[PDB]
Amino acid sequence: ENQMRYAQTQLDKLKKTNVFNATFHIWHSGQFGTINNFRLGRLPSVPVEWNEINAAWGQTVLLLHALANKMGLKFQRYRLVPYGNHSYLESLTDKSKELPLYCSGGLRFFWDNKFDHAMVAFLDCVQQFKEEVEKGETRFCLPYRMDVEKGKIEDTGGSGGSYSIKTQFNSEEQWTKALKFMLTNLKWGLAWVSSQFYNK
């Protein structure tokens, strides 16, 4: 009875804990949207090191890449390539541009532009994901809007505020909040994929 009860507990854990949820845990810790214990974003009071943001981007680029796989969605302009520490986007029209989804650190947070293109481009991939998910089901809706050309993530909970995903010309609190809404969309897109494919 003890063994059968345990085996039935394990069966119940595997029914609820889908393969995607077993891999990616998106939760809000303080003011950060965290993925797999990695804080995506930085605050002036809480200096999250770049190695933690780079890891978080590797976990994000893994999640979206894996989701697109399970949906059979191919991004229009970009190839997500998840390299754990140093994940990036490949442009499908000109491979000459590398869009690194990581930062080498230092004061380059205020001087490197490559990471801003890469991170707006990823927002495009999240948009195409959002479009693709709405196309499948109308009842589905992500909690926030994305303006790819502007690189903005809106807050439906707020008064129409939008926070620039780009680093430059932006403040840490807004950036971290943008990354927090993106992760929330990915958290919902993860809940949608789990809902669409858990019975299949």
């Binding site: 595997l14 393969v19 995607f20 077993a22 891999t23 893994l62 894996a66 796989n69 399970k70």
Partner: peptide
């Protein structure tokens, strides 16, 4: 478990 591991090692 095998079904989960196969899905894990085919999608992710």
């Amino acid at each position: 478990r095998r079904s989960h591991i196969l899905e894990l090692t085919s999608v992710i």
